[PDB]
Amino acid sequence: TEFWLISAPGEKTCQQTWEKLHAATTKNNNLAVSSKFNIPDLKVGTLDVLVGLSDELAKLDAFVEGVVKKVAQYMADVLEDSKDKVQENLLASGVDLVTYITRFQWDMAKYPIKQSLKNISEIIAKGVTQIDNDLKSRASAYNNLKGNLQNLERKNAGSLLTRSLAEIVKKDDFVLDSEYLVTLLVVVPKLNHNDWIKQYETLAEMVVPRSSNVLSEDQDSYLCNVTLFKKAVDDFRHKARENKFIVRDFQYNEEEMRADKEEMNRLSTDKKKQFGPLVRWLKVNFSEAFIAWIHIKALRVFVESVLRYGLPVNFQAMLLQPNKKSVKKLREVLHELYKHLDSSAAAIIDAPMDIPGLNLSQQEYYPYVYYKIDC
Amino acid sequence: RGKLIAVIGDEDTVTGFLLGGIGELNKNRHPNFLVVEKDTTINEIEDTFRQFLNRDDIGIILINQYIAEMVRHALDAHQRSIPAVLEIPSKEHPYDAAKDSILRRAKGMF
Amino acid sequence: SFFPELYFNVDNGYLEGLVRGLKAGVLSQADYLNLVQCETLEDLKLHLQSTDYGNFLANEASPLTVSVIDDKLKEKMVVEFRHMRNHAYEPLASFLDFITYSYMIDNVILLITGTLHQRSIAELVPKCHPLGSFEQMEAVNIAQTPAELYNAILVDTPLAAFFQDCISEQDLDEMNIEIIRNTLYKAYLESFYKFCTLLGGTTADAMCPILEFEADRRAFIITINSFGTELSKEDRAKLFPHCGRLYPEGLAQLARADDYEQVKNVADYYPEYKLLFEGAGSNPGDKTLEDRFFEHEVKLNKLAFLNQFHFGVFYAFVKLKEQECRNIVWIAECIAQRHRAKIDNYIPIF
Amino acid sequence: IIETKMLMGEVMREAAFSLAEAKFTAGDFSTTVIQNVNKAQVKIRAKKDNVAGVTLPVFEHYHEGTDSYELTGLARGGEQLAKLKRNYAKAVELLVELA
């Protein structure tokens, strides 16, 4: 959803602007839902200071746009299994995001109104940058854990060569105290096993016939151990190639398999351990991040309103939601209404591209202060 | 005014360091590096090493271990610090710690 | 339909069969699994000696080097291709010459880079790729004069028609050699596409997709690589070949593109490129878009063999065996550097 | 010095393997790199260090920005060659510390 903020520049008294923008407008037609944005009456600095804040809060808004919706992105990515109803998982407070925004007001308890817009914006920026680094660390940690589980999937994926043979191996069929007899595992495809019953008795000069047992049975492949003398293993290794198999050796990794089992279980339980805290942290932090976003929006509105309509302060802004396909008539009528509330003698018609210099125009212009929230 | 970097090594290693940003052709159009092609013999290799060693702007010199071994009787004569020679590994032959020109000075390195 | 079955085998039947015989020798997935498990380069030589390559490597010195293996594989490919070229006829001969023009377009860049740096062309000739070697003597004893080399190229080299995108030897001194290389390659690729369509029939229907993908991957990768360079959008747009399926408004949105996300947005409109971009994680440790494009190129070339009566099989064979040479080189590199962890990154062929 | 030698023993191996990856994709660019030399991107400044009264020469690693090998991966090399450049920058930092 999208929300618009309009200057509402006094007209000698708040009511003669607000009531006409809300009730008269809606009674003219239901092109948009209207409400008051409740701007705080901040202390005004010097005009030069305010011009500096112009750039400061011009860039800050684009910065917080990125940070807050990055919080939202990582929230959804962590909660991918149930990210549906995303607006509730994000909601800072209330029952609905619109319900939240249509009731916004400057919050003293987080930051006080008494200090200068410079300091207030600096502390908000501190909050947002710390949020960014906190994401980069904690979401990256969860991502590493998820990638570890994907590495586990790789460990359990593909042919038996790529997979960790682990518990699939029949431990009962191996030789023990292998100081003179050694067993090997180099057998694979199904199409080669037409006489495997004789092959695992005769593959090498002295193969022992029965403990050379089939360890696993896929549709496409058979996995089979073989037994031989200390120095005859190379003959089996070559004869496996002659019989068109590929190496699948297990090298007695029973305790290694047990430790690997413990580690895979540790990762599986770590996912459950860390997912909950991460979702809770993101849930709480999106609220603060978005509150800061709308705080920056309000300060932006106030500075631009003062610059557009020099002092005394007479800006009681409107929060407007356009209705279905209302935008065209809505903005036409708003422009027609604001013709004289903001001078039509300048801008509006056209403008070149002011790249040279410190700053350039990145926003449309109208006979009013307009800003937006992309909920 | 400032110092350069110089390289002696395989075509691959020289390509890597050049992509790293070391190469330059001097006012005489003489590179600060040399690829050790099989056509390049011990005498020319050590001639280039000596050139790097004398020229004052070279600074840090890189040499692979096997080429340094082939160059050794000049690395033993090299006895001033600033033209810093570094014996480095390669895909051609590995590096080893033993018998490095600078490490000759270490007697407690077991 | 152009009924190539009726008259293809009159002049190109022998080579049609021979090139497929050669294709039958390209290493299989199982052969790559055999090579993957070698302990040393000598062990790789032995395990490789059972395949089509046989004893090609047996005549080299005992201390095998991956450079030597690469050189021998390239030499074998060149020998086979030169045999086919010597036995080709006019139309197929022109097609094979078009294949060689690609390597000529890099050898010529070697030559001009050497000349502008004022080095003897006799030192450059040994470094040229044999498939695109300059037999013409007008390109010898150049006296290190860019004008002499440029006139030699225009008067005695097939690249004369491609250099007409450029107009002067002054362009050689001014334009970066990469821009020259890529402009020449664009001209060559468009000329190749027009040539294939004029051949028509199964040749067109089986080869044009490959060159279209070549154009599209050129566009994507040129765009993605150009971000961190002085290369302007206006000059970048000239490098895109106009054959690919991106040609109208896709190349335009790329020329307008200024970030990898925008390049991916352009790709999203094409299912065959959307898949490559989604699969190319490009983060450290896994497949890059280059790897995915190589895999798709290999698939496209493999498909060329499903059609029988057409020249496209020779181009497919050359590129497939080049991929196989690079695969064997990669496996040798992994064996030599003991970087076994990533030895599987070879692109399987058939 | 010994610890940094050990660290080189692996960083340079990674650099060589990255070069191998670069060649697999980009082809043989070594001749292009060896030819397009022009001017050095990286240079060194002799900096001073002090122990007791003795003077120890140390090296500042410094950048000129003249990357002539820009565009060398324009059509194929791209990310693989950029990663090669990056890894060899790592190796150059390590080796300047060693020197």
From TrEMBL, chain C:
InterPro entries associated with the record: ATPase_csu/dsu_sf, ATPase_V0-cplx_csu/dsu, ATPase_V0-cplx_dsu, V-type_ATPase_csu/dsu, V-type_ATPase_csu/dsu_dom_3
Principal localisation: membrane
GO cellular component: clathrin-coated vesicle membrane; lysosomal membrane; proton-transporting V-type ATPase, V0 domain
Matches recorded under Pfam families: vATP-synt_AC39
Location of this chain's protein in the cell: Cytoplasmic vesicle, Clathrin-coated vesicle membrane; Lysosome membrane
Keywords carried by this UniProt record: Hydrogen ion transport, Ion transport, Transport
Membrane topology, from the record: Peripheral membrane protein
One term of GO molecular function: proton-transporting ATPase activity, rotational mechanism
Domain of life: Eukaryota
Any single biological process term in GO: homeostatic process
Family (UniProt): Belongs to the V-ATPase V0D/AC39 subunit family.
Function: Subunit of the V0 complex of vacuolar(H+)-ATPase (V-ATPase), a multisubunit enzyme composed of a peripheral complex (V1) that hydrolyzes ATP and a membrane integral complex (V0) that translocates protons. V-ATPase is responsible for acidifying and maintaining the pH of intracellular compartments and in some cell types, is targeted to the plasma membrane, where it is responsible for acidifying the extracellular environment.
Subunit structure: V-ATPase is a heteromultimeric enzyme made up of two complexes: the ATP-hydrolytic V1 complex and the proton translocation V0 complex. The V1 complex consists of three catalytic AB heterodimers that form a heterohexamer, three peripheral stalks each consisting of EG heterodimers, one central rotor including subunits D and F, and the regulatory subunits C and H. The proton translocation complex V0 consists of the proton transport subunit a, a ring of proteolipid subunits c9c'', rotary subunit d, subunits e and f, and the accessory subunits ATP6AP1/Ac45 and ATP6AP2/PRR.
Protein name in UniProt: V-type proton ATPase subunit
Species whose genome carries this gene: Rattus norvegicus (Rat)
Gene it is expressed from: Atp6v0d1
UniProtKB/TrEMBL annotation, chain D:
Protein location: Cytoplasmic vesicle, Clathrin-coated vesicle membrane
UniProt function note: Subunit of the V1 complex of vacuolar(H+)-ATPase (V-ATPase), a multisubunit enzyme composed of a peripheral complex (V1) that hydrolyzes ATP and a membrane integral complex (V0) that translocates protons. V-ATPase is responsible for acidifying and maintaining the pH of intracellular compartments and in some cell types, is targeted to the plasma membrane, where it is responsible for acidifying the extracellular environment. May play a role in cilium biogenesis through regulation of the transport and the localization of proteins to the cilium.
Protein family according to the UniProt entry: Belongs to the V-ATPase D subunit family.
Oligomeric and partner information: V-ATPase is a heteromultimeric enzyme made up of two complexes: the ATP-hydrolytic V1 complex and the proton translocation V0 complex. The V1 complex consists of three catalytic AB heterodimers that form a heterohexamer, three peripheral stalks each consisting of EG heterodimers, one central rotor including subunits D and F, and the regulatory subunits C and H. The proton translocation complex V0 consists of the proton transport subunit a, a ring of proteolipid subunits c9c'', rotary subunit d, subunits e and f, and the accessory subunits ATP6AP1/Ac45 and ATP6AP2/PRR. Interacts with SNX10.
The protein's name in its UniProt record: V-type proton ATPase subunit D
Full-protein positions shown: 51 to 149 of 226
